[model samples]
Target chain A: RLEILDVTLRDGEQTRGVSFSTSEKLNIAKFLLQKLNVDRVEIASARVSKGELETVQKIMEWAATEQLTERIEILGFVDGNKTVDWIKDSGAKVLNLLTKGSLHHLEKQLGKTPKEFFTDVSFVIEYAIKSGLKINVYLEDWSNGFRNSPDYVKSLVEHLSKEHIERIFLPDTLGVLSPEETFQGVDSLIQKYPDIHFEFHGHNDYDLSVANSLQAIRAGVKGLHASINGLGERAGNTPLEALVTTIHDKSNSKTNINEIAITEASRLVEVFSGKRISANRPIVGEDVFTQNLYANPILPERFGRKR
Target chain B: RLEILDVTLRDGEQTRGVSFSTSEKLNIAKFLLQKLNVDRVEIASARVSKGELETVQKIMEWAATEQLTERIEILGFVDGNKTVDWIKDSGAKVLNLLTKGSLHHLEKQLGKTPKEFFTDVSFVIEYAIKSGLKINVYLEDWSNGFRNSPDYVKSLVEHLSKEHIERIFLPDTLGVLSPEETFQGVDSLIQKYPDIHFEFHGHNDYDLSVANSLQAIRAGVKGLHASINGLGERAGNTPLEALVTTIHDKSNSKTNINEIAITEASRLVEVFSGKRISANRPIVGEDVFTQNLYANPILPERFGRKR
Candidate 1:
């Protein structure tokens, strides 16, 4: 089954100097759920700010009343008890626990070794479990871990599998992986820990995020993360529309994505992020599907959209 | 021989509600000639407004003292003798005269038949020639004319060729030609008018402008009309950066284009036009040459860029 985890509201908002108002957040959420039919959406990071918290609460309340609470998620840093309390108070059920996957990140960014980081992550997971929130652990810089420190990645995956984490989120935090490396990294992890559900998150710093994400799926990843119009920090994340189209056309994968609503979703993100969609942008751009030559009749109409 | 025509002041200014200040126009003119080494720059249209006239004068005055006055061009309309005088007063030495190419545009937009239109255009050319300004004739809607009324297109070209025209510009005005059509159209014209200089102007409404441009060159067209970042009315014109790169890589065509200065020039156009360059845009985009996979050592540095 194909699942789309839209991060437009979370990471997309982090585009250099871009911020969406609360109404704009709710507006995009409604469009994503009601019109786009994405399987799940990650709205924001927890405890980022009061405005972000309010936006999360508003989305969660709407999702709950609309019977979509289980489909919405928020990223939470592993800060012991505070993260769990924040998730619970926001009325969101799914918490994506951000944890360091690479030994370097653990040692440098968190100032903790592999063993120490795992112990701290376990405490947060246990708290999330007790608080009745679904847990998806993010292995930040997991691609680097697979390359530079396999032992740490394996130990962390084994511990998370034993702890019965709902999902294992592997990310190329620095967007430093090729398609082949992405496949091999995820494939090896899935081979060693076959029972753990794995979600792949990619960045487009190298412009191969969509291709890498597809390779990750081919290598047996269970879910994929994307953002509308590929809005995010730096070069941004995998564009949601392009990812859905690639999977559908190249891999023949089935997805719940409302293909026709993709153009609308792209426009929404473009407006909120204030980033104009380049005319040559693959699927949803103004010129992507336009036929300047005599029109070809057999052009695939996947989304009932015309050039 | 290779040539560069800077359209940042003309088609670039036409980018959906975009306009440049006089100072910005003068700055761009200086940069295009001195820093970017552009051979010619189409500064403005004579029919735009008083402010545009002032801007064109500013660029011409700057070009005069630098021995680049002959490299400046202005778009002129076939409205009796008024546009010719406008071109002269603006201090530009070259006039790109715009005349309706298709019979439909002739009769509908100009309310004149092919004969009447030809007469008006010839009058403008003679006046421009007598005024000591070089003449380049633009066959507006030439692509559609070839498709719908070849006889009219042929007759118009034949009429223009009989005059002292320096160049014959064939525009896909409505951007309605396929790559195959572009090749066939230019090839047919080149064969019939072997001695005439043919410049092919294209638009990106069909996303095949680059491919069509290559086809045009293969068919022996002498010059290609383009705008930086493809900024123009509606869908936009051929992007100069992509066109130059494709020509260099595929056709081994040498041009005055300083490939290294492309990124800076593209950024300058984007800032001046207030249009954001899409990250996935082919060459100059922020994400174009980035590689997510560490295995691909062909980073931006390989391309002599520091993205």
Candidate 2:
């Protein structure tokens, strides 16, 4: 079975001028997991602010009571101790460690060598593991990393392969990949590391995130990350409803998403996040089901949106 | 060279309640061809209403004076003399003839056999040609046709190959194609009919139009159909700015579009069409450039949108 990880609370909240209240965050987290029944959720970035920390803490406490800690995660950085300790303090179980996926980023942003970068990453993962946090590594800009410096990516992943990581996330950080490139890059990595649990994170700068996510699944990814209404920075992450429906309709893969609750979930996110979805947004759009001159492959009734 | 056909006035105006006046149509037509330098513009549909006919006439008269009549087109139906006469009366030179690509649409909608359908299409094409109008054919639902009824698509194209059609447009009427399927379908037809100028008209219901258009380019399609800000019914058509930038940046092909004028053109269409594009729309959204975390493959300055 494929995993659907909703990043609406974390990445989706990163939209410009969008900041959810603590209650809004908690409620959305509950709705995503309990109502939409997604496989996992990244609730927040660790150490962003005091209120954000409390927000993650409250959600984590709720998840612990419901036996859902494993499904909730927080975005932590490779700061060795700060992020890991913050996540541990927040009562969260999973630590999504953000690491450099491109050599350009390593040299230009961090001024670190590959060996130094790997050392920092390894130290963070080990610390998070020791702090009783499950670890997933985000290879930030992995698409460009794979394109510009394939050997560097291979080295990083090979080293991460030796770590106690739960999943390795390959992100189209620049959102510049076409579907063919997404497939080729993802398929090659999966081929290289057959034993690793790989998840694909896509952005929509080129308006291909849904297509890219679909291609990644075709390339044998074990999981996919998305946000509701494609909310995030710039063109945003792949929209969750669009990706789920495309997977169900176009591919033979199975997801745990409750299609009946999608529209309500979309509306809730829109209200809380304050980023209104376009009227023509794929599954939950106002006009998608009522439009003319088309065969209805994605029916409104499937997503619980009435005609 | 690749061709960019802006269908904002024709398809973009079809967005729910959008309707442009004669001057708005004429101005957008001028902006698309003269300012943005797109290859062609489908200004209006033939025989829609008196005002629409007058709008087409005004644009056609303007194009004639500028010696750009060949760059202006109107969507004409296969209604023998009705649409052809209407287009001729409007002084438009090109007729984008809508024809059935699928056996399902042929048998179910028109209740006609292959022989009868081709007879009607032939009569319309001949009538348009005799009336001194250039003809392009829209193979409606061609993606489904190619997938479910390949022989019918083949037979129809084989007949069109013998006619004086300038381009054979293959549309994903339902917006239901994956990029892989789009490439395979367009590539097969292009390989089959090497001499035909085949265009790919993509829809955005699946949010895969940009990726599908890229694949179609890779598959050797000569042209693509798009609207400003993806304006049309339901999920709309592929947005022109997104398609052009993707093609220019990702492919070896060349287009006539002036990238600097894209934002103004998008704004113009947004004003006339009254369809507000989302803040995260690919090339021309309000927040796309200001937002963070991306490597900025598509820059704000490139589209004349200031940072």
Candidate 3:
């Protein structure tokens, strides 16, 4: 079994010049949850901006009516109780807590040591717990941390596991996980803590995010992070369409993705994000569904798409 | 080592609403063979159209001057002497002879029995040999054949093995092989015929072509076939950029692809094929090389691209 967490709102909006209006974000979130059966959707970062807050508020109201608030997650920061309060106000029940997974981010980026960063993270997790919110921990830049600061990543995992978060989000933050490294990186932690629900978040800088995510699953990570059309900062994360099809078609593991809904969802993302999938984008491109080759015709309808 | 045969011309040009002029074909062929160091380029199919013949004629003329006639291939039909004569007129050295790998293709598509199709294919192979052209056999719908009629596929390969072809191109013609199936499919053939240079052609119908091609290499395929930015019929072939990066990042396997020229060549193909790469396309898409993420921005100029 596998869980899919679509972070199209929280992370995918990180694509440059891409910011969804309140209605657009809410529409996307609703479609992802209601129409596509996405297990979880991280729709906004807590306290990011006025527009972001409004977006999350609208989404939370809708999810509330549908009794699916738990599936609507927000990326909350370790900045004391700020994010927790924001999530409380927004009426979202799930908080994906962002924290340092690398010593470099702890020391230089924040000018704090491991103990200090850990305390800050623990404080936010405690605050979220007090607010009755389900918590997921983000080991930001975990791929780099696993490579350069294994002790810190291990300690963070140990602390999070002790605190009993619902899920631990491990990010290949630098987009640097070679497929071989992804298996080993994910396997090492998964084998050590088989009881934990770990999700692998991948980036596509080296053109290997899909491969790396596949390896992470093969190595037994229970969850995967994806965005529609692979939208995000830099090279973006793995495409939901690509990853979902991979898991369903190539592996015994399963996800809640509605494969048929993928095309319409992708188009929705493209319209809102203003970043259309190129003609050659895998799975969801313009020309991909066309079959103009031949004396013999095979319909794209075989995959439930129009030619 | 991995031998990459880029079939952008013969297969990729099959993309819906995509066709290149004679100069466009010649330009793309030169860029593929010379600029990007593609190991092989299947540029056209024999006797397809008057325009196709002109395109192949011009491409072959240039390849002859560069002494790369063997690197320039045409997809030839098993239609007796017509295809052989077309290639002889086109001045190309390598012939990728198309044949029905499945009994269904022989019976339904061609209205020929196995014996009838085999005899015609043999005649074309023999005819090409007489014309001093190197032969490469394409077992069309080979994956389906392997599943439904293993005896037919095995006998075809066995017969082709008896006759010394340069490479045997086995396609998952309907884009229906799982990665596991791809590995097993390629592995079985490669292990059984160690002396034969076998190539695996993949399609992205299920969005698993990259994954399937990766599995093929892992399972010991001597060669992999791809198209520039995955241009082909229906969903398209495995992308050269994606497969090249996969081999380099995930394995010790090597390909002759010039990684830098990959972007340039992709743009070239996109321009000629009139098929623009989607923004988020891996490796060669616009968003791929951009560092538009807020925190740390690395310029695409570092990767030889402008903003």
Candidate 4:
């Protein structure tokens, strides 16, 4: 089975002009984990603001009662235990720590070498682990690193694989890979680190997120990161509705997603996010199931929609 | 070289809220031909209404003056002579005839066998050719046929290969095929009929249009059909902006599309059609070019935009 980690609450909120209220965040998180049946939900980034902190805190209260704290994660940064303490205080069990995935990002953006970067990352990881929080590292620009700086990606992954981390997320942070490239990049990593758990987080800058995700699954990644309605900055992330079906039908894999809840989930996000997906968005579009001379393979009934 | 035949004028108008006026139609047609440098432009469907006839007539008058009549096409039906005469009267040089591609569509919808269907198709093909017009055949529901009934698709192609048609268009009319399926379906046809021109028309219902099109190109397709904003009936046709860059960078082939004109063309269609494309739409979206920590390979400058 494939693990679908939905990032609608965290990465999706990165879209300009989209900010979910506290109650809306809790509602969507419940809908995603309970009704939509995605494997996990990323609710917020660590220490965004006091309001966002309160939003995550509210969701965490509900998650604690539901015993789903482990299934809820938050994006954290390597700030010498600042993010780790923030996440622990928020009651989120998993800290998805962000790290530079490319040599350019590390040297140009952070002005740090691999030795210094790993030191900072290990300190945060150790601090989070000791604070009773699981750790998942996100290689922020993994696609670029996989293409331009393979040695850096390998060393990062090799070092992270030896840590007390639960997963390593490989993101197409810039959304700049073709399907063939995605497949090869992921395949190489999965082969080299056979025992390491890897997840793929795709972006839709080139309108190839769904296809690139399918290729990632085909290349043997254990998990995928997607967002409802593909809501994110720029061209957004892989849409959960489209990726679920592609994983179920196209790729030789299965997910825990409830197809019947996909339409309602998309509509909920559309209403809350206020970033309306295009009318012709793949599976959840308004007119996708409209009757035509031909019968469509993607039936509306499968996704809890009626023509 | 891959030929890019833009269907924004014809298929794009099928979008629910889109209805271009005569001047808007003429302006878009001229922009597509003169500035965008697409190999051909499908302007309208033949015999839709008096108003549509008038629209095509106005475009034809302009095309005649520019000596670009051969570059303008109109969608026609398999009617014996109605569509042929309609296209000829409108002065379009090319007629794109719609034919049932799947046995289910042919038998269930049209209630016709191959013998009857081919007779009607050949009559229209011959009439159009005799009337001094080039002919292209759109195998509607072709992806379904290629999947469930390969013999039917092959026999239709074998018969059409004997005709004087200019090209055969294999359309994923319901937008259902994966990239691998698209490659196999198109590759078989291209290999069996190496002398015939074949174009792949993709849809985005599964969010795989760009990837499917790249696979089509990899499978030796000579041409592709696309629309400006992926505007059409359900999930819409392939967006020209995404497909152009994918073909150039991924497919080991090149096109005549003037990349610098793509963004302006997309904006022109958005303004004239009144069907605003999503802000996250591939290359032309407002947010796709925003500067970020990582550099995007699909540069805004390549498409006549500045970051």
TM-scores, all models, native as reference: 0.59, 0.97, 0.92, 0.97
Give every collision pair in model 2: none
- DockQ, all candidates in order: 0.08, 0.63, 0.39, 0.65
| lDDT per residue (tens digit) for residues B1-307 in model 3 | 6788999988766777888888888888898899889888998888887878878888877888999988988888888999999989888888998888887677777787777777888888888899998998899988888888888888888878888588888898878777768888888888899888888898876666777887787777788999887888767888888778767766778887877777788888888777776666766777665552223232354325662
lDDT of 1: 0.79
Which model is ahead, 2 or 3, in terms of DockQ? 2
Q: What is the per-residue lDDT of model 4 for residues A1-307, given as tens digits with 9 covering 90 to 100?
A: 9899999999767778888899999999999999999999998999888888888889989998998889999999999978988887787899999999999899998899898999999999998889999999999889989899999999999889879999889899989888999999999899998888889999988789989998898888999999998888888888899999988878779999999999999999989988766777788988776535666668899999983
Candidate 1: tens digits of C-alpha lDDT, residues A111-223: 87678878898899888989999888899889889899999899988888878577889898777665657889999999887887898999765455766787788888888
- Candidate 3 vs. true structure, TM-score: 0.92
In order, the Cα lDDT scores of the candidates are 0.79, 0.88, 0.81, 0.88
lDDT of 2 by residue, A204-227 (tens): 887888888988998999999999
Categorize the docking of model 4: medium
Following a full C-alpha superposition, what root-mean-square deviation does model 2 have from the true structure? 1.6
Candidate 4 ranges with C-alpha deviation above 4 Å: A291-293
Chain A vs native chain A, TM-score per candidate: 0.95, 0.97, 0.95, 0.98
Worst lDDT run of 10 residues, candidate 1 chain A, spans: A291-300
lDDT, candidate 1, at B297: 33
* Sort order, lDDT high to low: 4, 2, 3, 1
